[PDB]
Symmetry: C4
Subunit: 350 residues, 4 copies
């Protein structure tokens, strides 16, 4: 077997050391724009998010309302694919034709929306999603280092060329990144075992500390860019517990962040608002739980504290990210990724 020289680490084991803050760096001047799909050196991505946040491909998170609320703030949602093809396509259609400053829209001013797909019924699901107006797709899986994903992306390329965008994953190392890169993925998702609803050491024992995963994948992505001239955006998926973890994820190189629990707490999540013993909560369950996979166990069902509407919470979260970015001397995500000083902290200090 193959072993590693260092153990993996989570976001909580890191802190950012401030850099030179110049007079021009104030929150309001920080640009959080970021690329969603791959492009060549010298080019710009065909799709750029206004904010680096995307909602998870989960039944309990990304419904039509979430997609609209998030797109309005500049991010994008990936309508869950764990439902009928007709049902998912309807949600995409609804978002695209809802209108019939930081909003994320297409050339027709329609909100952008993404849709998750699987490696099984894609031949019938993809065409339906495309027809419905899906702007981007993403294969939804915990282990994306699979020949099945290569096959799915291949079918999409043969049928649509580079006209249809498709993200792939999840993977946690350079090899996994490289495989999906050569297979043609437009963006690659990072993360196995870091999700809030994931108790890896109770499931199959696969995974890697999210921080180490991102750092390793990002290094491979940059090496890949230098060899081929192709820049593939990467997504840090799961493990975001505090707002500063967002800044860390981006600083380590992730172009954008996928969150489930964070967004489930909002009014716009498709789940029921349940007042439990004085405290308002919201339902939240993983895609691996029986409560969802049937559309030993493989998931968990829980509650998250109600946080109100998405808007106010995202604004608050991003204000802190912008502020921290200025402490690090960065006005943009690329500048933060270049200038960030990231230190590991001792277990005792935690």
């Amino acid at each position: 077997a193959k072993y590693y020289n260092e153990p993996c680490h989570t976001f909580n084991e890191y802190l950012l050391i401030p850099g030179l803050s110049t007079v021009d760096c104030i929150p309001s001047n920080v640009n959080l724009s970021t690329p969603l799909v791959k492009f060549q050196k010298g080019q710009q991505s065909e799709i750029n998010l206004k904010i680096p946040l995307v909602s998870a491909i989960m039944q309990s998170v990304s419904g039509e309302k979430m997609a609209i609320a998030l797109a309005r703030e500049g991010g994008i949602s990936f309508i869950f694919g764990s439902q009928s093809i007709e049902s998912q396509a309807a949600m995409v259609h609804a978002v695209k034709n809802f209108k019939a400053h930081n909003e994320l829209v297409d050339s027709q001013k329609r909100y952008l929306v993404g849709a998750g797909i699987n490696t099984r019924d894609f031949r019938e699901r993809v065409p339906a999603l495309v027809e419905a107006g899906a702007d981007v797709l993403c294969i939804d899986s915990s282990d994306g280092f699979s020949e099945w994903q290569k096959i799915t992306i291949g079918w999409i390329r043969e049928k649509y060329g580079d006209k249809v965008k498709v993200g792939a994953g999840n993977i946690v190392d350079g090899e996994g990144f490289r495989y999906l890169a050569d297979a043609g993925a437009d963006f690659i998702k990072i993360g196995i075992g870091g999700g809030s609803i994931c108790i890896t050491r109770e499931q199959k024992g696969i995974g890697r500390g999210q921080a180490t995963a991102v750092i390793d994948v990002v290094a491979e992505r940059n090496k890949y860019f230098e060899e081929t001239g192709i820049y593939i955006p990467v997504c840090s998926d799961g493990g975001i517990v505090y707002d500063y973890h967002m800044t860390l994820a981006l600083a380590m190189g992730a172009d954008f962040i996928m969150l489930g629990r964070y967004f489930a707490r909002f009014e716009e999540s498709p789940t029921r608002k349940v007042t439990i013993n004085g405290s308002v909560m919201k339902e939240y369950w993983g895609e691996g739980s029986s409560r969802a996979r049937n559309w030993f166990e493989e998931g968990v069902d829980s509650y998250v504290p109600y946080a109100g509407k998405l808007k106010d919470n995202v604004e608050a979260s991003l204000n802190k990210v912008k502020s921290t970015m200025c402490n690090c001397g960065a006005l943009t995500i690329p500048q933060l990724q270049s200038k960030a000083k990231i230190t590991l902290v001792s277990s005792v200090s935690i």
Copy 2:
């Protein structure tokens, strides 16, 4: 004294990083067959388990019923030797003559069964076990790095040559492995202080994290194979807390796994089913406890939650191992041992 460069680690400190999963790797096609006794390069072992699990040499685990239930699923039990020679032999006889898809049997279609022996009364115990039809023997001890085990194996070779198989142990490093290898052991057991009923730092303070122990012994076993052409199967004994620890143990190189607590929870364990305050439990005590050694203290007595019949639980456990194996791109244990990517995780992440 001699010191080491790195501290030892337990199975809980590791996770498997996925490799390339091909279209042909699905649970039902995974082969969990594995060698039980030594053979030369180019050969196959005279005894191959259908599943890599064996029940512990304990009064509270491996009785006649356990041996039959486990052999039916492809594994093998080691009837405890902490009882009279006549009593142990009777259990072996019963298993061998019980019949008078994955079942483990001999050329006469009789279930395979093993028997534990000690370094004291083996001159009278071994012949009785052989006559009773024991398929394999195993010296039962916490510290197998002993001249006593060399003597016992030697007596067996002089009297039966290589016709009678005998495992030895336990040891935790290359030196211990090497000593029992040269002494003639057919398989070597790994593990001191990792058992669930073992509070080393309350006993004699001897031991080593199970993971480090396996990794070190496996490296020595492979070095030994390359020097002599002799492949000696090794057994990871104790410390299995979760199903994924099984996959880890195998991935690190262990050919099979010995479990006590895991099997004690089943209907077939020779202990009493005790309903305690609404919850059904089963008795479980170590071979070092006074409740067993008399056939300061040196053991513990406890209860384990009832899990029902062995069959359903083993099937469930092995389905997860097979699934994880496919995530790692492996259709067989040898392929998993060759391709596994194993990472240590930080203490904080735990």
Copy 3:
């Protein structure tokens, strides 16, 4: 991004290993004098504290009474700047004209006092503080690695040359130290995220273990001294939980220590003494809490156990520091910084 080879550590992760204690080293002969502002090689600082302790630039700590009580024992207070310019100047005036063995005074025998300033209204605040008789100033900020601090210090130099002393900070590495050094700071404060009222991983996630921060800054300060002949005193700000942390901070190279919580517990702190359920406590809130910044959240409000008058507590604390210094063979802070043997301890031992 830039990463580090070692994780950062807090004061609690260190212990001092005794050195040779000579017959002349007894507590009463230990000299705790220390420089407050920069000087050139061969010179002495224009301002030397009698004891290496200074009270924090906080509304809940450094008021007029604190400043007088601390100056009487040899230390100095930095009147908080989070109040009106007129209000802060009045406190400075009161301390300077209060008299109208270890006391810290000027050539006119008036108690020394410091005053915090900000990077915004300094053009009006500084002149008022100077006129009021402030002996030293200090820019109050969590992230001193800012062009804003360079601008503030520059304005002070152009208007007063080196006649007005101004400390800057906070920073946590050599780069941050170097920037404020070249900018002209008279002393530099070390520390981000180590304060007792700081939950970094709930704010912006910036910071560094206080110990590592001091050690790193001190190395840069000594390198700087060797290149330019300029010795800049550094202050370890925050994170002092036990008296021995004081000895550690000094041993690692800090010239003096800034404390908030430690001093808040005293009768002289400007807060209310609140008897809560039998125990007398004192109010303590951070400068980032809403309860103070308005003169999502950015601070905490709490209570600290009443410790009585400053005098008896400081004497007790410093007696232990002096005693420990003799164990390390040191009669002065510079000798301790030169001879200290500092070891990291394992997480398990904690």
Copy 4:
């Protein structure tokens, strides 16, 4: 300041890896004899303990009864010196003239006894202790790296030459060992901050993990032996929590072990047996507590569970040490120190 490459570790962070156990190694044949005072290469120590245990120089541990009970089993007690010279000498006299298989006695068959001394009144205390019949003395201090100890040992040599034996300490590194060695100490005690009644990080913050301390001192002692031909026995003082820590301490190189809490639990300790809420306990306080030093605070007062008479407990403890020694292939302490395989374990495994 000076820093170290590795953090210090306690005994709990180590485990012994078994070595080859030969047929002749059984508990009853294990020899636990060990040297108490220094000798030259090729020689034997003038005083050899039958068992490597000595009771602490504490009012709550080593009284006349303890000294007799321990000497009867082969160890020796150091009558506490924190009492009047007349009072301490009386206890020594009583032990020496109490008679007016493993017993530790002199050529006149009188029990051996030790006595603690301080660096202040030794000119009057030593002669009184010698006259009373003290077999060995030991300077009692937490920081033995002192010119005061050099002075005390020097006075003893000038007045008695090498006729009076005197141990010194405590120290925790090679430098401290070396200083007391050159000063003439007959044995050196190791340990600062490891005692059970020591909360270092609440006192002065001085110390070092006991394990690292012993390992480091032992290396220096062996280097010293090779340079000068003088072998100085070293004592691991404090930190023994479990019986196996004894085996560890010896394996790491300590010739003998000093224990306080361990012996306080016995009927023979000079403290009161207090039945508290059904459980019989014994008083135990440190020499630094006010309850003893007057013959801020510097010690703790507590209770230890009653263990009965010393004899049965020591026999039990040493049987486990002997058994563990055989697992390591050692029949004597020197052989264990030479053959022991010692591994550090991960924090997670603890």
